[PDB]
Amino acid sequence: SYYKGQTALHIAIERRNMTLVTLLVENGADVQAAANGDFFKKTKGRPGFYFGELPLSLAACTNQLAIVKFLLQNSWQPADISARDSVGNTVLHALVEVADNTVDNTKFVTSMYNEILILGAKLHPTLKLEEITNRKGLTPLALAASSGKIGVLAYILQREIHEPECRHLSRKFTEWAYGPVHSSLYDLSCIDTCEKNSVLEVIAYSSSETPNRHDMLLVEPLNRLLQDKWDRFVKRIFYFNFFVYCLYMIIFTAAAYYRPVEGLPPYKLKNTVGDYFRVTGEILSVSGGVYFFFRGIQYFLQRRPSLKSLFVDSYSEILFFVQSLFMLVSVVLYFSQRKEYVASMVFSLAMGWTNMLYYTRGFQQMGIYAVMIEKMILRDLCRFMFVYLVFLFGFSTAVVTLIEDGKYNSLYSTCLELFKFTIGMGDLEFTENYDFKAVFIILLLAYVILTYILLLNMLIALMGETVNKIAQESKNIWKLQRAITILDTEKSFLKCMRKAFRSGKLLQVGFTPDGKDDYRWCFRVDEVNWTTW
Amino acid sequence: FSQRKEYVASMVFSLAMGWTNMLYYTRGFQQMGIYAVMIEKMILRDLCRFMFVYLVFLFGFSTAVVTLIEDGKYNSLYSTCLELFKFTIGMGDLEFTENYDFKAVFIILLLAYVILTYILLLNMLIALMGETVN
Amino acid sequence: RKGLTPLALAASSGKIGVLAYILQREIHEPECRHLSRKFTEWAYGPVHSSLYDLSCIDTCEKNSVLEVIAYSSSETPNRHDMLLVEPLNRLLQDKWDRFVKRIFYFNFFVYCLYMIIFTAAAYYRPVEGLPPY
Ligand code: NA
């Protein structure tokens, strides 16, 4: 089962013997044999070499150029290119999947890709390879984007061919040049809207374990495209949303500040303006709470993410949902003739007020500041509170055990007294009912020294990580966050209107191999070159 | 079992030390283990080199201040040492006694002590990060 | 006389280069393969699997390399950096992940339970005078 399915053609190909391969081919053996052995499986056991399951793919992925040309250019029985294996991957898909982000590997892969593509175009110009999809509905470009292959994506996006009868395979062109300045064009077909899955959509919604989510948006066209969309309309949409949220929060605060103090709600309103205003404010607050609840549940339903990504990703959708839950529980308690609705309301109010850092994205420096804040919260709280809590509990138990009786004979009181030392209110003489004063003093001094050493170690370790390798990541994270916001806003059409669109229609190549012309929704960029004439 | 009362002191020392003796199990977790390693290295490499100067300064200024005072509650050495130690944790008084002469000398001594101690703490935290060049 | 072989002597005195060379020695000549310690079971395309000899590394019945490196005194030059050699890191990771993890977790749980019991017992001591009670 492990070596099952192998055929002589595979050995001949993978031994680097051209003459033996030719002699074996002369016999007439089938060139469409597929090996289903477990040794060629995806990740079934660490050992294995996936190569597409076809002899043509084997030749392509093993540095074989003359051999693959011979296989594809024989008069006896040429091998079809549109072949698909059990998984459905083609030679192009296998080439994409073999890449592992190494400079030599990247140059090899791109050279082989270009050669095979031009040969395929030359032999059968009528057919197009890049639009063939496997079972998962992924094209080579989508597959490259999903798995974080920087080199292949970068090569494909700005591909340039400078040969007659092959211009129509290119994606980057040159509209005109004059002196030190020339303007280029980039093809946007299947980048922002493909009707199945675009590059931007795949990169934005990918799970966090993907290798290079942050750094994959630095490729040329994407940055400018996102900036254009933003500056056209996302700015106005975002500012309107921010204003509305601020107004709602102000109303909620003002309504909560004037609650009545009589006992056992509900309270019967009186014939005065203040009562009407207060009731209106409360109604508005409840409406906002239910709105946020429904939006959050809708998002959680559509995305359906995993568990480990619920805090690394969606770090804000959970907070808004929790605030809404607090509001609803407060309402339920209020209409049940109890008094804990006040506690629920204050928790909701504080959390909502602190939940306003979400809107700092859209401003560069503030966004970077917020990114650093959240990274530190998620990366240091757990690692630095454990030791402190251990020390506090141990010394508090010792001190409480020493005392005989009095007001400080509990555990809560002594824990609070020892916590006071960390914020600059230590007493050192907060009780006198005990024996062996020397033990008391020694314990307190040891606790103080250990805590201060611990704080010093925490601030040195915290700056150690920043070797200047903290800002370049923060900027990329902020850019990814803004990109997600732009995509979401575009998907949620403003009102019922629809004006957004990538760029203008244009004629660049003129004519395909067929007589008919074509249009490909380009996006012009102006650049000035002084050297390398 | 000898009908005494110091077993309480022994028991509390044992309890506190045992509770703090639990950092041994942080090995087996990568980041926590590295944190504990840094903690122990700092304890063994800075305590002796940084407490000597502070204790010297504290004792000298405490002896001077005690010698200045005439009589009262703060006419001992333990009391004045504790009062001057309070300054380091944010509870300085600057007027904790009034039974003496030559108030200017008292104020000058206290100000000099405060300035020297703060300079010393600053130097300690700069020297401590200097060693970490990554 | 001290019962040290060249490998043990190299490990004890902190000679990184000699130890690194000896551990992964490779000979590619006929009639001399049996002197090697690293081999090649098979190769296929861009992938090939190697083998490492573990005789007298983790159990020699007198003194192994791991035992000598672990218990060496602190004045030895390169105790910390001598475990970065190839086979040793993976060997230690394997042993850990097989069974030391479970042993360690059980020990941690037992210690926590004992400490909780001791704290609770000490918190409720009687206050009458002149023990025993
Ligand atoms: Na203070």
Numbering used by the authors:
A (entry chain D): 197 to 603, 627 to 752
B (entry chain A): 531 to 603, 627 to 687
C (entry chain A): 331 to 463
What do the study's own words say?
The capsaicin- and heat-activated receptor, TRPV1, has served as a model for deciphering lipid modulation, which is relevant to understanding how pro-algesic agents enhance channel activity in the setting of inflammatory pain. Identification of a pocket within the TRPV1 transmembrane core has provided initial clues as to how phosphoinositide lipids bind to and regulate the channel. Here we show that this regulatory pocket in rat TRPV1 can accommodate diverse lipid species, including the inflammatory lipid lysophosphatidic acid, whose actions are determined by their specific modes of binding. We captured several states of TRPV1 ranging from channels in which the VBP is empty to those bearing different bioactive lipids, including distinct phosphoinositide species, brominated phosphoinositide analogs and a pro-algesic lipid, lysophosphatidic acid (LPA). Together, our data show how the VBP accommodates a range of bioactive lipids and how occupancy of the site corresponds to the structural status of the pore.
To determine the effect of the resident PI lipid on channel gating, we devised a protocol to eject this lipid and render the binding pocket empty. First, we used capsaicin to displace the resident lipid from detergent-solubilized channels. We then washed out the competing vanilloid followed by reconstitution of the channel into lipid nanodiscs of defined composition and devoid of phosphoinositide lipids. These samples were applied to grids held at 4 °C or 25 °C (temperatures at which TRPV1 is normally closed) and then taken forward for cryo-EM analysis. The final maps were refined using C4 symmetry and resolved to 2.9 Å and 3.7 Å for the 4 °C and 25 °C samples, respectively. In both cryo-EM structures the vanilloid pocket is, indeed, unoccupied by either a resident PI lipid or capsaicin. Interestingly, we observed that Y511 is flipped toward the binding pocket in these two structures, akin to what is seen in the agonist-bound state, demonstrating that reorientation of this fiducial side chain primarily reflects ejection of the resident lipid. We also see transition of a π-helical turn in S6 to an α-helical configuration (π–α transition), resulting in rotation of the lower half of the S6 helix by one residue. This π–α transition rotates the gating residue L679 away from the central axis with a narrowest restriction now formed by rotation of M682 into the pore. Indeed, consistent with our previous study6, the difference in the B factor of M682 compared to a nearby residue (A680) is 15.01 Å2 for data at 25 °C and 10.57 Å2 for data at 4 °C. This is substantially higher than the B factor difference in the apo state (~1 Å2), which shows that M682 is more dynamic in the α state, and thus suggesting that M682 is sufficiently malleable to pass ions in the α state.
